[PDB]
Design a protein around this nucleic acid. Structure first.
Ligand code: MG
Ligand code: MG
Ligand code: MG
Ligand code: MG
Ligand code: MG
Ligand code: MG
Ligand code: MG
Ligand code: MG
Ligand code: MG
Ligand code: MG
Ligand code: MG
Ligand code: MG
Ligand code: MG
Ligand code: MG
Ligand code: MG
Ligand code: MG
Ligand code: MG
Ligand code: MG
Ligand code: MG
Ligand code: MG
Ligand code: MG
Ligand code: MG
Ligand code: MG
Ligand code: MG
Ligand code: MG
Ligand code: MG
Ligand code: MG
Ligand code: MG
Ligand code: MG
Ligand code: MG
Ligand code: MG
Ligand code: MG
Ligand code: MG
Ligand code: MG
Lengths: 64, 53, 204, 111
RNA sequence: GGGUAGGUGGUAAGAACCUCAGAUCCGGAGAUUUCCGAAUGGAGCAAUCCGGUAGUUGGAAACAGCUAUCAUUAAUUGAUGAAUAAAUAGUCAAUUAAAGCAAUACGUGGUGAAGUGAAACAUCUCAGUAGCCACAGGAAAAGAAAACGAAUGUGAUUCCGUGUGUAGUGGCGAGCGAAAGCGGAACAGGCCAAACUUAUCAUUAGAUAGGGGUUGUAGGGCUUGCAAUGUGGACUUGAAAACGAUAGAAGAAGCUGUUGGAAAGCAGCGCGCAAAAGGGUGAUAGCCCCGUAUUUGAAAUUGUUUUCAUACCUAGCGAGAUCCCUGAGUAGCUCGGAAAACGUUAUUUUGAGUGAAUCUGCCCAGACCAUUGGGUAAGCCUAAAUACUAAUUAGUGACCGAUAGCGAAACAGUACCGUGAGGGAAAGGUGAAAAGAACCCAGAGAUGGGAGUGAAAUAGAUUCUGAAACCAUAUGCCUACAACG
RNA sequence: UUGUGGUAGACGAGCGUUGUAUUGGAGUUGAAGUCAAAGCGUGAGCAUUGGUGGAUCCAAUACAAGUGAGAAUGCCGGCA
RNA sequence: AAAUCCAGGUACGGGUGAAGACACCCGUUAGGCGCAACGGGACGGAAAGACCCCGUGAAGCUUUACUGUAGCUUAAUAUUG
């Protein structure tokens, strides 16, 4: 599914309000961008993660 | 009409579908005027005046 | 929803946030939890009332009461004549199982209560199953014969041990009293009267 | 135990037959009836059927048999007493054999 | 174990047996449990087909019997091992769990309309309802203040009444509608991270396993003393006792006469009651029977509570130092949405982006600032009151009484309809007892008329009572020159 | 004394069905049901007798309603 | 068997009438009841008119009617040196 692999945070369903307040259901998708990290002997394994998690990995020295 | 819930009296008058025994806080208008006859205890009567106030 | 592999993600980070929140190290604390909660008390600085609360707890435990029942009994005794500091003591000590424990046919007050609930207990103008009836100073409590048919008997001995505010003859199973317990027979475990004022604030 | 058993003398206390003494030959507990010899004589109109070795003859005319009677209408008959009378029974247990035994309540006669 | 003298399940008679060395029957505990079905050795058109492996018995072998085992995924462990040295991917083996179903009912979460109303309609309502899906549990959810809110105030959550159809919110239209406070049901608060310290990891630890700690009238750690050996739990194992649940035992009291087929009705004279609830017995029985009130009883399984011991947690008040720790892609902010009564806004939440501080700190008191005051976010667990009844036991009905009551009183989700999903009926009563009509006559027979049983046969299996419409027969009157609601 | 035609409609007074609560009463010497007849009422309605029928029913005062059928190309069953 | 059927014992002429009568008014004619025929009438039967109108009805279709939207395209921003 279109979801992160580190966390379980997925899409967010909501309303598409326009002028005249017409209601149409829409979906916000998370920015799943590929990322490589070093775990278990630094073994890089591409993992589709959200940019938010990408920032977290970068600050946590993990992303190297 | 009984104030102290005697047990010997309650053991009897239970196989008699006709007669019945009740406490002062249990009798109502209908039970009173269905009686056509009633035997009232003296201390029940003293409590009666107290309840009326 | 796939091969979540908690090892894969947990080790993937080794600290992170989700990792540490879940950190399997998660012990049991399954004895820490119970006991400390159990029941506490002490007195503080800002409210004073701390003493009242602790004393209330002690008194309720001495007789095995729920706070709601206590509020009911205080409401009952509150209205009458005046400085009723002699009435509520009799009210708190008029419990049937309380009388059964001071009567001496049970090892402990709650055990006596269990007996009462199990239908051991015979009264005068009535009988008894509920362990909460308020008894009158001069009332009899003839013990059953079935209980004696189960000789554990060890009890009868306690009966004589007694406390002066209870007059019960051993083996013969009978009891009544007069001169309701004075404060001497209500020992210093709980002997104060500002718990009364605590309930006056909390209960109208 | 049971009020009526197979064998003891019994009489009828209600119906067309009054004071009919007899011996119970069989008891159906489920429908609560009792076959007593000499009482409730019914006469089935015996037809003729021939489909078996015994049915080849099956000689049956006006055979009179026994009709079942409700156990409520039955009452035990006393024998030990010099003056026999109809009464009700108890279920005393004598410690001599520790076995339940029927005893009448208007006398002291066993069974 | 209880309990007896009958039993071999119903339409069901007969034949043949069993049973007093204690049968059938009731209760507790076990044994066996074909095939399909989550189905799981492989397949497949369900109740079928085709096997592998390791044993063991016959055969001279193929083979055939008799056993056990053989699915997938996830976790742990071990062995083996690519591109490519090492190492992984991968492969194999062992152990432990998961699959599914149902209670036409309750819970949580995700998703989520339309008919309709607004007398049209798009904002709005309907409605976060129906439906779809995921996960449970015996309840679930929630939960211990970065809170309410305006005070010399209350002090987890949940549920009920009121506050009130109030403040408010609404093409300010249709409509929607709290949060405080007050009265009640129940009541319980707990535990980690970090400091500091111990031991070990090529100790590059930034990791593992322990001691220490759990906060707001700030708490804890650092150093230094006094008082403590207790009280209490949401608590483990045992032992004992009590109250029950799953079969049961005992359990009082009536005769006579009359109508009647039959008495229990009616009448006379009695009797018992902690039993006058009910059912049956040829009509309407307190005393005919079974029962009921009441007193009792468990070998075995199981529930609740209590007692004792036993593990495991749990403890106060000071002094000094002025040092350290208190949860970060977090709280805020911007851009689009939403939750709350609110149609987006102080508070809560988040898809994208950015991004702080560290008790003289941070958040809140409906924009915002200052003063005052309240509270300690970014970690976890939490009984009780609360929601519901497919099922087990007891019971009740100014509830229904075969067109009613569940669709289904009978063998009803059946017959039947449709490829299928699906749709879906009608139908009860002889008599106290079959004593269910032997026999005679007519007829080919069914059947009918007698006979017989029965109180009744015009109660006869067409089987309680038998209405009208409808069809025939007949006593009496009228009617074939007569225009007719 | 003045009145009494009447649809929509307003108001008032009553009848009838079933059950419940209190009183009393009838019933295998025959209740309900059901059919017939030459009765009584201002109206809904109410009796008497006889046949059939085989076990419940009636009167008074109150109470509660699935309480009143001629029509809906009404539903079901039967019969023209 | 079938649709049909308010109960019928169901004439004609002129007139009348909700405006075209088996049934009303005034006259005329006609014994009771069938059978075989043919269709004049019973505004005959079957189908709650499809034409027309009405309803602040439904549905399908169309467009520079309104309000939106899938898709396509452009820019900012993150991945992004
Ligand atoms: Mg909408
Ligand atoms: Mg046995
Ligand atoms: Mg709409
Ligand atoms: Mg509308
Ligand atoms: Mg409308
Ligand atoms: Mg929970
Ligand atoms: Mg018992
Ligand atoms: Mg018995
Ligand atoms: Mg008896
Ligand atoms: Mg009876
Ligand atoms: Mg804020
Ligand atoms: Mg909303
Ligand atoms: Mg502060
Ligand atoms: Mg904090
Ligand atoms: Mg039905
Ligand atoms: Mg019917
Ligand atoms: Mg079929
Ligand atoms: Mg005949
Ligand atoms: Mg017939
Ligand atoms: Mg009939
Ligand atoms: Mg003539
Ligand atoms: Mg003529
Ligand atoms: Mg004429
Ligand atoms: Mg008038
Ligand atoms: Mg009536
Ligand atoms: Mg009659
Ligand atoms: Mg009706
Ligand atoms: Mg026909
Ligand atoms: Mg004209
Ligand atoms: Mg036509
Ligand atoms: Mg029309
Ligand atoms: Mg329109
Ligand atoms: Mg419309
Ligand atoms: Mg682009």
């Amino acid at each position: 599914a279109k979801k992160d692999q580190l966390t379980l945070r997925g899409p967010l369903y909501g309303n598409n309000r326009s002028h005249s307040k017409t209601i149409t259901r829409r979906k916000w998708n998370v920015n799943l961008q590929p990322c490589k990290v070093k775990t278990a002997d630094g073994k890089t394994t591409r993992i589709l993660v959200s940019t938010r998690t990408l920032r977290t990995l970068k600050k946590h020295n993990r992303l190297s | 009409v009984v104030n102290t819930l005697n047990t010997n009296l309650e053991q009897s008058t239970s196989n008699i579908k006709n007669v019945q025994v009740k406490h002062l806080d249990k009798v109502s208008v209908r039970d009173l005027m269905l009686a056509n006859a009633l035997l009232v205890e003296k201390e029940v009567l003293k409590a009666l005046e107290g309840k009326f106030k | 929803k796939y091969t979540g592999s908690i090892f894969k993600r947990s080790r993937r980070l080794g600290f992170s946030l989700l990792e540490n929140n879940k950190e399997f190290s998660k012990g049991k604390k399954r004895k820490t939890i119970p006991g400390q909660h159990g029941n506490r008390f002490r007195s503080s600085t800002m409210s004073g009332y701390a003493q009242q609360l602790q004393e209330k707890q002690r008194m309720q435990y001495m007789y095995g009461i729920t706070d709601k029942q206590f509020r009911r009994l205080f409401r009952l005794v509150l209205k009458q004549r005046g400085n009723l500091a002699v009435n509520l003591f009799r009210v708190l000590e008029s419990r049937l199982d309380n009388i059964v424990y001071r009567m001496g046919f049970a090892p402990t007050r709650r055990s006596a209560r269990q007996l009462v609930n199990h239908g051991h207990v015979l009264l005068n103008d009535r009988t008894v199953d509920t362990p909460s009836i308020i008894l009158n100073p001069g009332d009899k409590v003839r013990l059953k014969a079935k209980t004696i048919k189960i000789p554990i008997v060890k009890a009868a001995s306690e009966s004589g041990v007694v406390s002066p505010f209870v007059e019960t003859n051993n083996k013969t199973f009978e009891g009544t009293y007069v001169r309701f317990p004075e404060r001497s027979e209500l020992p210093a475990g709980i002997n104060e009267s500002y718990v009364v004022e605590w309930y006056k604030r909390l209960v109208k | 135990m049971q009020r009526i058993k197979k064998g003891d003398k019994v009489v009828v206390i209600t119906g067309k037959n009054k004071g009919g003494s007899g011996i119970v030959l069989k008891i159906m507990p489920a429908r609560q009836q009792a076959i007593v010899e000499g009482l409730n004589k019914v006469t089935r109109h015996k037809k003729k059927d021939q489909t078996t070795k015994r049915a080849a003859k099956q000689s049956t005319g006006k055979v009179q048999q026994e009709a079942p009677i409700f156990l409520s209408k039955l009452a035990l008959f006393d024998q030990k007493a010099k003056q026999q009378t109809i009464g009700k029974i108890k279920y005393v247990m004598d410690p001599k054999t520790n076995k339940k035994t029927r005893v009448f309540k208007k006398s002291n006669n066993t069974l």
